[PDB]
Short mmCIF file of C-alpha atoms and ligand atoms in Angstrom, two decimals:
data_model
loop_
_atom_site.label_atom_id
_atom_site.label_comp_id
_atom_site.label_asym_id
_atom_site.label_seq_id
_atom_site.Cartn_x
_atom_site.Cartn_y
_atom_site.Cartn_z
CA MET A 1 -25.68 -60.78 -80.60
CA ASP A 2 -27.13 -57.30 -79.82
CA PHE A 3 -25.21 -54.98 -77.58
CA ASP A 4 -26.35 -51.34 -76.28
CA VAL A 5 -23.60 -48.89 -75.77
CA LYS A 6 -25.50 -47.61 -72.67
CA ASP A 7 -24.90 -51.03 -71.10
CA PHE A 8 -21.08 -50.35 -71.47
CA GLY A 9 -21.10 -47.09 -69.51
CA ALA A 10 -21.86 -44.88 -73.00
CA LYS A 11 -23.66 -41.55 -71.76
CA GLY A 12 -24.55 -39.97 -74.84
CA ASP A 13 -25.05 -36.78 -73.25
CA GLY A 14 -22.94 -34.33 -75.34
CA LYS A 15 -20.35 -33.79 -72.74
CA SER A 16 -18.54 -37.41 -71.72
CA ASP A 17 -16.11 -38.78 -74.06
CA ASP A 18 -17.93 -42.12 -74.68
CA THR A 19 -15.36 -43.27 -77.09
CA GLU A 20 -14.00 -46.36 -74.97
CA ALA A 21 -17.76 -47.34 -74.04
CA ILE A 22 -18.65 -47.40 -77.77
CA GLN A 23 -15.53 -49.26 -78.97
CA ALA A 24 -16.15 -51.50 -75.86
CA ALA A 25 -19.39 -52.68 -77.37
CA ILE A 26 -17.92 -52.65 -80.74
CA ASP A 27 -15.26 -55.26 -79.27
CA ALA A 28 -17.84 -57.18 -77.45
CA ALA A 29 -19.92 -57.57 -80.65
CA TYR A 30 -16.85 -58.46 -82.68
CA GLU A 31 -16.06 -61.36 -79.96
CA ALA A 32 -19.32 -62.74 -79.91
CA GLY A 33 -18.76 -63.30 -83.88
CA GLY A 34 -20.71 -60.45 -84.90
CA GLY A 35 -23.79 -58.28 -84.07
CA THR A 36 -25.44 -55.13 -84.03
CA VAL A 37 -24.27 -52.14 -81.74
CA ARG A 38 -27.47 -50.08 -80.73
CA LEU A 39 -27.18 -46.62 -79.67
CA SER A 40 -30.35 -44.84 -78.55
CA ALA A 41 -30.98 -41.27 -79.19
CA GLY A 42 -28.39 -38.76 -77.81
CA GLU A 43 -25.28 -37.10 -78.68
CA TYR A 44 -22.11 -39.12 -78.01
CA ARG A 45 -19.06 -37.52 -77.70
CA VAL A 46 -15.86 -38.85 -79.20
CA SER A 47 -11.97 -38.51 -79.31
CA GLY A 48 -9.26 -39.81 -81.34
CA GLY A 49 -5.96 -41.80 -80.91
CA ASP A 50 -2.13 -41.78 -81.06
CA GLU A 51 -1.90 -41.73 -84.63
CA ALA A 52 -4.24 -40.45 -87.25
CA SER A 53 -4.59 -43.86 -88.67
CA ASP A 54 -6.36 -44.70 -85.45
CA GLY A 55 -9.29 -42.73 -86.20
CA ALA A 56 -11.80 -42.66 -83.31
CA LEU A 57 -13.88 -45.59 -83.45
CA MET A 58 -12.72 -48.84 -84.81
CA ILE A 59 -15.37 -50.98 -86.48
CA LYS A 60 -14.84 -54.76 -86.81
CA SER A 61 -16.05 -57.43 -89.22
CA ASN A 62 -19.52 -58.70 -88.94
CA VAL A 63 -20.28 -55.56 -86.60
CA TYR A 64 -22.98 -53.36 -87.47
CA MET A 65 -23.92 -49.77 -85.75
CA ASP A 66 -27.41 -48.94 -85.79
CA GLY A 67 -28.40 -45.67 -84.25
CA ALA A 68 -32.05 -44.15 -83.67
CA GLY A 69 -32.18 -41.98 -86.68
CA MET A 70 -30.18 -39.41 -88.40
CA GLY A 71 -30.27 -36.33 -86.24
CA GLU A 72 -31.21 -38.50 -83.23
CA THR A 73 -28.00 -40.38 -82.69
CA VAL A 74 -25.17 -37.92 -83.21
CA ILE A 75 -21.65 -39.17 -82.71
CA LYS A 76 -19.48 -35.97 -82.46
CA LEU A 77 -15.78 -35.08 -82.10
CA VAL A 78 -14.95 -33.73 -78.62
CA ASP A 79 -14.39 -29.78 -78.65
CA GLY A 80 -10.35 -28.95 -79.00
CA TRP A 81 -9.24 -31.96 -80.73
CA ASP A 82 -6.22 -30.84 -82.63
CA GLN A 83 -4.66 -34.01 -84.37
CA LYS A 84 -5.82 -34.99 -88.18
CA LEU A 85 -8.00 -37.96 -87.59
CA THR A 86 -8.49 -40.56 -90.41
CA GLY A 87 -12.19 -41.87 -89.86
CA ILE A 88 -14.48 -40.80 -86.83
CA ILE A 89 -15.93 -44.58 -87.83
CA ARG A 90 -13.09 -46.68 -89.74
CA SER A 91 -11.78 -49.91 -90.33
CA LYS A 92 -8.45 -51.04 -89.36
CA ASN A 93 -5.36 -50.46 -91.69
CA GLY A 94 -3.99 -53.77 -92.73
CA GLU A 95 -7.00 -55.84 -91.91
CA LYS A 96 -9.32 -56.90 -94.56
CA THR A 97 -12.60 -56.00 -92.73
CA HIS A 98 -15.78 -57.15 -94.13
CA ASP A 99 -19.61 -57.56 -93.66
CA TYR A 100 -19.80 -54.21 -91.37
CA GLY A 101 -21.68 -51.25 -91.61
CA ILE A 102 -23.32 -48.32 -90.09
CA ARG A 103 -26.93 -47.23 -89.89
CA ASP A 104 -29.28 -44.36 -89.01
CA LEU A 105 -26.70 -42.10 -87.21
CA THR A 106 -25.05 -38.80 -87.54
CA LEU A 107 -21.25 -38.16 -87.63
CA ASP A 108 -20.48 -34.41 -86.59
CA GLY A 109 -16.90 -33.53 -87.09
CA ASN A 110 -17.10 -30.68 -84.99
CA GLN A 111 -15.00 -28.38 -87.25
CA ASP A 112 -15.75 -25.05 -85.65
CA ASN A 113 -14.48 -26.31 -82.44
CA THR A 114 -11.51 -28.51 -83.59
CA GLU A 115 -8.54 -28.10 -85.85
CA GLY A 116 -6.87 -30.88 -88.25
CA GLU A 117 -8.16 -32.69 -90.98
CA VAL A 118 -11.00 -34.88 -90.15
CA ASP A 119 -12.53 -37.73 -92.38
CA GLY A 120 -15.99 -39.00 -91.09
CA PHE A 121 -16.23 -42.50 -92.56
CA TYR A 122 -12.90 -44.14 -93.61
CA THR A 123 -12.59 -47.85 -95.17
CA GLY A 124 -9.97 -49.84 -96.98
CA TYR A 125 -6.84 -52.29 -96.39
CA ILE A 126 -3.25 -50.63 -97.59
CA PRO A 127 -2.83 -48.07 -99.96
CA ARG A 128 -0.91 -49.34 -103.11
CA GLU A 129 -1.12 -53.08 -101.81
CA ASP A 130 -3.42 -55.80 -102.95
CA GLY A 131 -6.29 -56.58 -100.67
CA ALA A 132 -9.62 -55.06 -99.69
CA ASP A 133 -12.45 -54.34 -97.28
CA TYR A 134 -15.65 -55.91 -98.71
CA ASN A 135 -19.32 -56.02 -97.93
CA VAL A 136 -19.64 -52.42 -96.55
CA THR A 137 -23.07 -50.61 -95.82
CA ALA A 138 -23.89 -47.09 -94.87
CA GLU A 139 -27.64 -46.78 -94.72
CA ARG A 140 -29.46 -43.57 -93.88
CA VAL A 141 -26.21 -41.97 -92.33
CA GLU A 142 -25.53 -38.47 -92.19
CA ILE A 143 -21.80 -36.88 -91.95
CA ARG A 144 -21.51 -33.30 -91.39
CA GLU A 145 -19.05 -30.66 -90.35
CA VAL A 146 -15.75 -32.74 -90.66
CA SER A 147 -13.00 -30.58 -91.84
CA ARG A 148 -12.12 -32.78 -95.01
CA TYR A 149 -14.00 -35.90 -96.30
CA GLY A 150 -17.51 -37.00 -94.99
CA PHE A 151 -17.89 -40.36 -96.50
CA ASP A 152 -14.36 -41.51 -97.49
CA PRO A 153 -14.28 -45.32 -98.52
CA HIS A 154 -10.80 -45.99 -99.38
CA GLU A 155 -8.29 -48.43 -101.16
CA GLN A 156 -9.54 -51.11 -101.82
CA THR A 157 -12.95 -51.65 -101.01
CA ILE A 158 -15.41 -54.31 -102.50
CA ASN A 159 -19.29 -54.12 -102.58
CA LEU A 160 -19.49 -50.81 -100.63
CA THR A 161 -23.25 -49.62 -100.38
CA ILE A 162 -24.13 -46.07 -99.45
CA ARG A 163 -27.68 -45.45 -99.77
CA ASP A 164 -30.25 -42.99 -98.58
CA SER A 165 -27.58 -41.19 -96.73
CA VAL A 166 -26.44 -37.35 -96.44
CA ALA A 167 -23.01 -35.47 -96.41
CA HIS A 168 -23.33 -31.79 -95.90
CA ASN A 169 -21.09 -28.87 -94.76
CA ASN A 170 -18.00 -30.99 -94.81
CA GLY A 171 -14.79 -29.02 -95.71
CA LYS A 172 -13.82 -30.60 -98.71
CA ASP A 173 -15.98 -33.61 -100.57
CA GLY A 174 -19.04 -34.75 -99.04
CA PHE A 175 -18.39 -38.30 -100.55
CA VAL A 176 -15.02 -39.76 -102.02
CA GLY A 177 -14.81 -43.11 -103.36
CA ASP A 178 -11.33 -43.70 -103.33
CA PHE A 179 -10.62 -47.37 -105.16
CA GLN A 180 -14.09 -48.62 -104.80
CA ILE A 181 -14.84 -51.77 -106.74
CA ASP A 182 -18.38 -53.33 -107.50
CA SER A 183 -20.04 -50.57 -105.24
CA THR A 184 -23.11 -48.62 -105.11
CA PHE A 185 -24.21 -45.11 -104.10
CA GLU A 186 -27.65 -44.88 -104.18
CA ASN A 187 -30.36 -42.13 -103.42
CA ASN A 188 -27.91 -40.05 -101.60
CA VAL A 189 -27.67 -36.29 -101.17
CA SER A 190 -24.48 -34.38 -100.93
CA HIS A 191 -24.87 -30.72 -100.47
CA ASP A 192 -22.92 -27.44 -99.19
CA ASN A 193 -19.62 -29.09 -99.04
CA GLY A 194 -16.32 -27.05 -99.22
CA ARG A 195 -15.35 -28.80 -102.72
CA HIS A 196 -17.05 -31.75 -104.33
CA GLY A 197 -20.39 -33.44 -104.00
CA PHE A 198 -19.21 -36.73 -104.99
CA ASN A 199 -15.72 -37.35 -106.15
CA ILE A 200 -14.90 -40.94 -107.84
CA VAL A 201 -11.23 -41.39 -107.95
CA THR A 202 -7.83 -43.65 -107.70
CA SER A 203 -8.83 -46.58 -110.09
CA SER A 204 -12.65 -47.25 -108.99
CA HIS A 205 -14.55 -49.45 -111.33
CA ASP A 206 -17.95 -50.87 -111.69
CA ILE A 207 -19.62 -48.34 -109.84
CA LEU A 208 -23.30 -47.55 -109.92
CA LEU A 209 -24.26 -43.62 -108.87
CA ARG A 210 -27.99 -44.25 -109.40
CA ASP A 211 -30.38 -41.16 -108.14
CA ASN A 212 -27.92 -39.30 -106.11
CA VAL A 213 -28.37 -35.40 -105.94
CA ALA A 214 -25.50 -32.86 -105.43
CA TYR A 215 -25.91 -28.98 -104.91
CA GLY A 216 -24.44 -25.86 -103.25
CA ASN A 217 -20.96 -27.39 -103.46
CA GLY A 218 -18.01 -25.12 -103.74
CA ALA A 219 -16.65 -27.46 -106.55
CA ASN A 220 -18.31 -30.53 -109.06
CA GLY A 221 -21.50 -31.96 -108.22
CA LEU A 222 -19.92 -35.20 -109.07
CA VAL A 223 -16.35 -35.70 -110.54
CA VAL A 224 -14.87 -38.97 -112.03
CA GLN A 225 -11.42 -38.69 -112.54
CA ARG A 226 -7.99 -40.63 -112.30
CA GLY A 227 -6.48 -38.62 -109.61
CA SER A 228 -2.85 -36.97 -109.06
CA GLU A 229 -0.95 -39.97 -109.40
CA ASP A 230 0.18 -42.21 -112.56
CA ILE A 231 -2.14 -45.13 -111.82
CA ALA A 232 -5.13 -47.06 -113.75
CA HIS A 233 -7.62 -45.03 -114.83
CA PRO A 234 -11.37 -45.49 -113.26
CA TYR A 235 -13.66 -47.50 -115.69
CA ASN A 236 -17.09 -48.87 -115.67
CA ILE A 237 -18.97 -45.90 -113.76
CA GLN A 238 -22.69 -45.74 -114.48
CA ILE A 239 -24.25 -42.58 -113.38
CA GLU A 240 -28.13 -43.00 -113.53
CA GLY A 241 -30.87 -40.35 -112.71
CA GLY A 242 -30.55 -37.58 -109.76
CA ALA A 243 -29.83 -34.07 -109.86
CA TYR A 244 -26.60 -32.30 -109.95
CA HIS A 245 -27.39 -28.64 -109.62
CA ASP A 246 -26.28 -25.25 -108.35
CA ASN A 247 -22.68 -26.15 -107.92
CA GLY A 248 -19.64 -23.92 -107.85
CA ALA A 249 -17.99 -25.71 -110.97
CA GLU A 250 -19.29 -28.15 -113.48
CA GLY A 251 -22.36 -30.34 -112.36
CA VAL A 252 -20.62 -33.61 -113.40
CA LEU A 253 -17.35 -33.85 -114.58
CA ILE A 254 -15.67 -37.03 -115.84
CA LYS A 255 -11.84 -37.02 -116.97
CA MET A 256 -9.48 -40.00 -117.78
CA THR A 257 -11.88 -42.67 -117.16
CA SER A 258 -13.04 -45.54 -119.62
CA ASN A 259 -16.62 -46.66 -120.22
CA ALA A 260 -18.49 -43.76 -118.33
CA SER A 261 -22.17 -43.30 -118.65
CA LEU A 262 -24.32 -40.43 -117.67
CA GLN A 263 -28.12 -41.13 -118.19
CA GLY A 264 -31.32 -39.56 -117.07
CA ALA A 265 -30.04 -36.75 -114.73
CA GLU A 266 -31.18 -33.23 -114.02
CA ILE A 267 -28.30 -30.75 -114.51
CA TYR A 268 -28.88 -27.00 -113.94
CA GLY A 269 -27.64 -24.03 -112.49
CA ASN A 270 -23.86 -24.83 -111.98
CA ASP A 271 -21.37 -21.91 -112.55
CA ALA A 272 -19.63 -23.94 -115.24
CA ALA A 273 -20.65 -26.27 -117.65
CA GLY A 274 -23.35 -28.71 -116.90
CA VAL A 275 -21.13 -31.65 -118.17
CA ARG A 276 -17.62 -31.88 -118.95
CA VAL A 277 -15.91 -34.87 -120.23
CA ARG A 278 -12.11 -34.65 -120.70
CA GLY A 279 -10.06 -37.40 -122.11
CA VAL A 280 -12.58 -40.44 -121.70
CA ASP A 281 -12.67 -43.46 -123.59
CA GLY A 282 -16.13 -44.92 -124.02
CA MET A 283 -18.73 -42.14 -123.11
CA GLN A 284 -22.49 -42.15 -122.82
CA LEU A 285 -24.76 -39.01 -122.38
CA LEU A 286 -28.04 -40.06 -122.88
CA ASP A 287 -31.55 -38.43 -121.95
CA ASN A 288 -30.40 -35.96 -119.59
CA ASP A 289 -31.95 -32.68 -119.08
CA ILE A 290 -29.49 -29.77 -119.12
CA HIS A 291 -30.16 -26.13 -118.77
CA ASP A 292 -29.25 -22.75 -117.09
CA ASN A 293 -25.58 -23.75 -116.47
CA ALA A 294 -22.39 -21.65 -117.11
CA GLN A 295 -23.79 -19.40 -114.61
CA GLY A 296 -20.32 -18.27 -113.55
CA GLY A 297 -19.54 -17.34 -117.16
CA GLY A 298 -18.70 -19.75 -120.00
CA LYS A 299 -20.38 -20.51 -123.31
CA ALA A 300 -21.23 -24.18 -123.31
CA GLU A 301 -23.76 -26.64 -121.53
CA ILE A 302 -21.90 -29.61 -122.39
CA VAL A 303 -17.94 -29.79 -123.14
CA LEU A 304 -16.41 -32.72 -124.72
CA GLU A 305 -12.57 -32.52 -124.97
CA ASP A 306 -9.34 -34.24 -124.37
CA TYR A 307 -7.29 -34.37 -121.72
CA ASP A 308 -3.55 -33.75 -122.54
CA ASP A 309 -1.31 -35.09 -119.76
CA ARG A 310 2.08 -34.79 -121.76
CA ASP A 311 3.27 -32.16 -119.18
CA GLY A 312 1.97 -34.25 -116.11
CA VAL A 313 2.59 -37.24 -114.22
CA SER A 314 1.88 -39.75 -117.14
CA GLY A 315 3.48 -38.24 -120.06
CA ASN A 316 0.13 -39.21 -122.19
CA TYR A 317 -2.32 -37.34 -124.27
CA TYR A 318 -5.79 -38.77 -123.70
CA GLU A 319 -8.30 -38.57 -126.41
CA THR A 320 -12.28 -38.66 -126.06
CA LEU A 321 -13.19 -41.51 -127.90
CA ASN A 322 -16.34 -43.83 -128.53
CA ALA A 323 -18.98 -41.12 -127.33
CA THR A 324 -22.74 -41.67 -127.77
CA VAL A 325 -24.40 -38.30 -127.07
CA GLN A 326 -28.30 -38.65 -127.92
CA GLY A 327 -31.82 -37.99 -126.49
CA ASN A 328 -30.47 -34.71 -124.18
CA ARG A 329 -32.56 -31.63 -123.77
CA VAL A 330 -30.13 -28.99 -123.72
CA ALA A 331 -30.88 -25.50 -123.33
CA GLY A 332 -27.54 -23.98 -124.61
CA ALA A 333 -24.57 -24.96 -126.64
CA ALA A 334 -23.08 -28.63 -126.97
CA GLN A 335 -19.51 -28.90 -127.82
CA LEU A 336 -19.24 -32.31 -129.06
CA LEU A 337 -15.52 -33.36 -130.15
CA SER A 338 -14.66 -36.89 -130.47
CA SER A 339 -11.58 -38.73 -132.26
CA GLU A 340 -10.81 -42.20 -133.74
CA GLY A 341 -13.68 -44.87 -133.98
CA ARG A 342 -17.56 -44.41 -134.33
CA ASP A 343 -19.11 -41.65 -132.85
CA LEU A 344 -22.83 -40.79 -132.67
CA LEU A 345 -23.09 -37.27 -131.67
CA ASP A 346 -26.66 -35.40 -131.31
CA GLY A 347 -26.70 -31.71 -130.59
CA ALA A 348 -30.06 -30.20 -129.08
CA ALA A 349 -31.70 -26.66 -129.11
CA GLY A 350 -28.54 -24.61 -128.94
CA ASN A 351 -26.16 -23.86 -131.51
CA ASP A 352 -23.64 -26.67 -131.11
CA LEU A 353 -20.28 -27.43 -132.53
CA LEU A 354 -19.90 -31.25 -133.73
CA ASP A 355 -16.62 -33.04 -134.75
CA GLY A 356 -16.46 -36.59 -134.89
CA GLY A 357 -12.83 -36.64 -135.57
CA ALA A 358 -11.35 -39.77 -137.36
CA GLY A 359 -13.86 -42.80 -138.20
CA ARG A 360 -17.23 -43.08 -139.38
CA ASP A 361 -19.39 -40.86 -137.58
CA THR A 362 -23.22 -39.87 -137.39
CA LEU A 363 -23.87 -36.42 -136.38
CA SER A 364 -27.05 -34.52 -135.86
CA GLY A 365 -27.79 -30.80 -134.95
CA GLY A 366 -31.20 -30.67 -133.65
CA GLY A 367 -32.56 -27.31 -133.29
CA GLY A 368 -30.90 -24.20 -133.79
CA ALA A 369 -27.65 -22.99 -135.83
CA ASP A 370 -25.02 -25.93 -135.71
CA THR A 371 -21.44 -26.12 -137.10
CA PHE A 372 -20.29 -29.54 -138.25
CA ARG A 373 -16.48 -29.49 -138.31
CA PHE A 374 -14.20 -31.62 -140.63
CA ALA A 375 -10.74 -30.64 -139.28
CA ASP A 376 -8.82 -33.46 -141.58
CA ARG A 377 -9.43 -34.65 -145.02
CA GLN A 378 -9.02 -38.14 -143.29
CA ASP A 379 -11.72 -37.73 -141.04
CA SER A 380 -14.49 -38.58 -143.67
CA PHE A 381 -13.35 -40.38 -146.59
CA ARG A 382 -13.78 -43.42 -148.95
CA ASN A 383 -10.92 -45.30 -150.11
CA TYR A 384 -9.25 -47.19 -153.25
CA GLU A 385 -11.64 -50.29 -153.04
CA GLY A 386 -14.69 -47.95 -152.81
CA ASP A 387 -14.98 -48.86 -149.01
CA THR A 388 -17.84 -46.23 -148.26
CA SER A 389 -17.68 -46.80 -144.59
CA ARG A 390 -15.30 -44.20 -142.69
CA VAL A 391 -17.82 -41.75 -144.62
CA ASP A 392 -19.36 -39.47 -141.99
CA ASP A 393 -23.05 -38.84 -142.25
CA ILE A 394 -25.08 -35.66 -141.04
CA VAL A 395 -28.67 -36.45 -140.12
CA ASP A 396 -30.47 -33.18 -140.52
CA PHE A 397 -28.59 -30.66 -142.18
CA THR A 398 -30.66 -27.54 -142.33
CA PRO A 399 -29.66 -25.09 -145.41
CA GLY A 400 -29.52 -21.39 -144.46
CA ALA A 401 -29.03 -22.40 -140.60
CA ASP A 402 -26.35 -24.84 -140.28
CA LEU A 403 -22.91 -24.60 -141.57
CA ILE A 404 -20.05 -27.11 -142.55
CA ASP A 405 -16.60 -26.09 -141.38
CA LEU A 406 -14.02 -27.18 -143.70
CA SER A 407 -12.11 -24.22 -143.17
CA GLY A 408 -8.92 -26.23 -142.40
CA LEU A 409 -8.97 -28.30 -145.59
CA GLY A 410 -8.07 -26.22 -148.34
CA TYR A 411 -10.57 -26.74 -150.76
CA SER A 412 -11.77 -23.45 -152.73
CA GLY A 413 -15.42 -24.23 -153.40
CA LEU A 414 -18.22 -26.11 -154.87
CA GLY A 415 -17.38 -27.49 -158.43
CA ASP A 416 -16.81 -30.73 -160.35
CA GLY A 417 -14.86 -32.40 -157.56
CA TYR A 418 -11.37 -31.96 -159.07
CA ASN A 419 -8.74 -29.24 -158.83
CA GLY A 420 -9.39 -28.27 -155.08
CA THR A 421 -13.19 -28.21 -155.45
CA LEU A 422 -15.93 -30.50 -153.96
CA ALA A 423 -18.95 -32.00 -156.08
CA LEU A 424 -22.44 -31.81 -154.47
CA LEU A 425 -23.94 -35.31 -155.56
CA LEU A 426 -27.16 -37.09 -155.33
CA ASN A 427 -26.92 -40.79 -155.04
CA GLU A 428 -28.94 -43.38 -156.96
CA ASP A 429 -32.19 -43.42 -155.33
CA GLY A 430 -31.93 -39.77 -154.01
CA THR A 431 -31.97 -40.45 -150.31
CA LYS A 432 -28.49 -39.00 -149.53
CA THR A 433 -26.51 -35.96 -150.84
CA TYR A 434 -22.70 -36.24 -150.84
CA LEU A 435 -20.12 -33.43 -150.77
CA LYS A 436 -17.20 -35.41 -152.66
CA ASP A 437 -13.41 -34.85 -153.52
CA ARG A 438 -12.99 -36.80 -157.19
CA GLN A 439 -9.20 -36.55 -156.94
CA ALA A 440 -7.68 -39.47 -155.01
CA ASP A 441 -5.03 -38.78 -152.54
CA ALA A 442 -1.53 -40.76 -152.61
CA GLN A 443 -3.27 -43.35 -150.45
CA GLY A 444 -6.11 -44.01 -153.09
CA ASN A 445 -8.41 -41.89 -150.32
CA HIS A 446 -11.54 -39.54 -151.24
CA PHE A 447 -12.60 -36.84 -148.76
CA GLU A 448 -16.47 -37.39 -148.82
CA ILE A 449 -19.22 -36.39 -146.50
CA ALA A 450 -22.70 -37.78 -146.49
CA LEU A 451 -25.70 -35.39 -145.81
CA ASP A 452 -28.87 -37.34 -145.49
CA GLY A 453 -31.77 -36.37 -147.61
CA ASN A 454 -31.91 -34.69 -150.97
CA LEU A 455 -30.41 -31.22 -150.51
CA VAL A 456 -28.73 -30.63 -154.00
CA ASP A 457 -31.16 -27.72 -154.72
CA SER A 458 -31.32 -26.42 -151.40
CA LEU A 459 -27.42 -26.24 -150.27
CA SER A 460 -25.37 -23.21 -151.48
CA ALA A 461 -21.94 -22.23 -151.04
CA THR A 462 -22.92 -20.04 -148.10
CA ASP A 463 -23.66 -23.42 -146.19
CA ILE A 464 -20.01 -24.16 -146.04
CA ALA A 465 -16.95 -22.39 -144.75
CA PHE A 466 -14.21 -23.13 -147.22
CA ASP A 467 -11.53 -21.11 -145.52
CA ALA A 468 -10.94 -19.16 -142.00
CA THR A 469 -12.25 -15.80 -143.56
CA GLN A 470 -15.44 -17.66 -144.32
CA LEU A 471 -15.74 -19.30 -141.27
CA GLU A 472 -15.26 -15.92 -139.28
CA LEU A 473 -18.34 -14.53 -141.22
CA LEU A 474 -20.19 -17.74 -141.23
CA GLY A 475 -19.57 -19.51 -137.87
CA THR A 476 -22.85 -20.48 -135.94
CA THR A 477 -21.19 -20.82 -132.52
CA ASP A 478 -19.35 -19.26 -129.92
CA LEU A 479 -16.85 -22.34 -129.24
CA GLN A 480 -14.28 -21.95 -132.09
O1 LIG B 501 -5.41 -37.12 -102.43
C1 LIG B 501 -4.27 -37.40 -101.86
O2 LIG B 501 -3.52 -36.44 -101.79
C2 LIG B 501 -3.79 -38.81 -101.70
O3 LIG B 501 -4.52 -39.31 -100.65
C3 LIG B 501 -4.48 -40.47 -100.51
O4 LIG B 501 -5.01 -41.44 -99.25
C4 LIG B 501 -4.22 -41.24 -98.22
C5 LIG B 501 -5.43 -41.35 -97.14
O5 LIG B 501 -6.25 -40.42 -97.05
C6 LIG B 501 -4.90 -41.57 -95.79
O6 LIG B 501 -3.84 -40.55 -95.03
C7 LIG B 501 -3.93 -42.87 -95.82
O7 LIG B 501 -3.17 -42.92 -94.34
C8 LIG B 501 -2.55 -44.30 -94.26
C9 LIG B 501 -1.14 -44.03 -94.32
O8 LIG B 501 -0.74 -44.21 -95.79
C10 LIG B 501 -0.37 -45.24 -93.85
O9 LIG B 501 -0.90 -46.57 -94.31
C11 LIG B 501 -0.74 -45.54 -92.47
O10 LIG B 501 -0.24 -46.77 -92.14
C12 LIG B 501 -0.03 -46.74 -90.62
C13 LIG B 501 -0.69 -48.02 -89.89
O11 LIG B 501 -2.00 -47.46 -89.84
C14 LIG B 501 -0.43 -48.19 -88.63
O12 LIG B 501 -0.77 -47.00 -87.83
C15 LIG B 501 1.37 -48.44 -88.50
O13 LIG B 501 1.61 -48.82 -87.33
O14 LIG B 501 2.16 -47.54 -89.31
C16 LIG B 501 1.70 -47.34 -90.42
C17 LIG B 501 2.28 -46.00 -91.11
O15 LIG B 501 2.14 -44.84 -90.71
O16 LIG B 501 3.33 -46.32 -92.16
O17 LIG B 501 -2.14 -45.42 -92.35
C18 LIG B 501 -3.13 -44.43 -92.51
C19 LIG B 501 -4.71 -44.56 -92.59
O18 LIG B 501 -5.06 -45.79 -92.91
O19 LIG B 501 -5.09 -43.73 -92.16
O20 LIG B 501 -2.76 -42.89 -96.80
C20 LIG B 501 -3.49 -42.81 -98.01
C21 LIG B 501 -2.25 -42.65 -99.01
O21 LIG B 501 -2.22 -43.08 -100.37
O22 LIG B 501 -1.21 -42.43 -98.42
C22 LIG B 501 -4.50 -41.62 -101.78
O23 LIG B 501 -5.85 -41.62 -102.38
C23 LIG B 501 -3.52 -40.84 -102.89
O24 LIG B 501 -3.95 -41.67 -104.06
C24 LIG B 501 -3.95 -39.44 -103.16
O25 LIG B 501 -3.01 -38.90 -104.00
CA1 LIG B 502 -9.76 -52.49 -93.30
CA1 LIG B 503 -11.62 -25.22 -87.34
CA1 LIG B 504 -28.59 -27.62 -132.07
CA1 LIG B 505 -14.80 -40.53 -134.80
CA1 LIG B 506 -29.78 -27.42 -136.57
CA1 LIG B 507 -7.95 -35.66 -137.91
CA1 LIG B 508 -15.45 -39.01 -139.01
#
């Protein structure tokens, strides 16, 4: 059954406190078993409760609020409110609220004329307890001028959808997804917020972030992170399309997350790296357009690195693992470092640094002068049985342009492959060129690298750095 707020005494005049009248329509719609609460165009002033957890308006199960449009219907916090208010619209703490939503309206937190932390839209059940809100929809909603978090769906919410919405000029993050599950953020814009455009945090998993745009935020365009507590990391985070540009830090930052994907985005004009990946297990970075980042200083368009939390709350060291970096256009340097397991690392037009770490990795530099680093003799090797897997291959080594950094391995130079030298060998059919250590170590292992193609004639000693002195002289990058 459909309910109009004006029928409950709501004025929408910008001056009268309409909180009770709008909540009356909510409660009547909830008592009918569900329905739509409609708000014609106008500015409805609203106030909070006794506690921050009271929010301002309590949406209920099977209740949807439909305004007359963003800008047309504005729900604005009263002048002078001085109490922390957790959700101008919110579901009840300790209730699994379900099948509710808001559409075509503006939430205005009025931070210029209020004091206290205010969040726009708050969802969820109980922090650190099992249970969830579910089937939650925000469609064409604008949240602005809240002092902290604009869209703040919270622990836990399953099947939250926020689409075609905007968060701007909020004091902290425009969108936070806090322990969101099986949820969708699609075709949203988050801009000119105090800190992050989008912030996916607190164990959120199976999240689609499709065709979102974040610009002009004080910190990240999008950050996906564990957060500050020792809890399960987020995982299964798929970032598809959109644009993360002109933000105060990295365009996209992903850290302490498993199975994350960033594909087909445009990423530019950010003050820090365009993309930064710290301690991510399973990272796919495909077909993105990355340019003109590090505007605030910095040497890298793309940064892959570990996340050392040993001095932090978990006590753990988190490696970036299982990385696939292909198809990107990158107008600047990519630092692509990974660890145990098979990595596929493709640089682009910049002067890139590539290191797949342990395991059988396939590396390519693309354009420019690229350094392929092998930090450990066990990072590319063939074993006693002749198991040729675990041997890295470099797809496109360019003699006179690229560099093989062996400076930490203690080989003296090219030679016959014994006594600390490496042999340069062509395989039987002349399809691959090998650098080989013919001397087995105590475990029977042989350091070996495959260079795809025939380079036995074009490769020279000046294409390999065999010690730190040679690396300082020959290094192609500004990232070592
Ligand atoms: O980033 C961070 O610093 C951490 O943020 C964490 O999320 C916070 C939320 O932002 C809210 O402030 C949320 O407030 C909860 C309270 O935790 C509490 O459960 C409260 O419960 C009330 C209940 O509503 C009712 O009034 C009853 O009568 O008394 C209860 C009581 O006061 O104990 O309701 C508040 C609410 O729902 O607004 O709390 C969480 C939190 O985790 O504490 C979180 O993301 C954390 O991981 C971050 O580190
Ligand atoms: Ca709830
Ligand atoms: Ca203020
Ligand atoms: Ca390159
Ligand atoms: Ca590897
Ligand atoms: Ca190259
Ligand atoms: Ca190693
Ligand atoms: Ca390797």
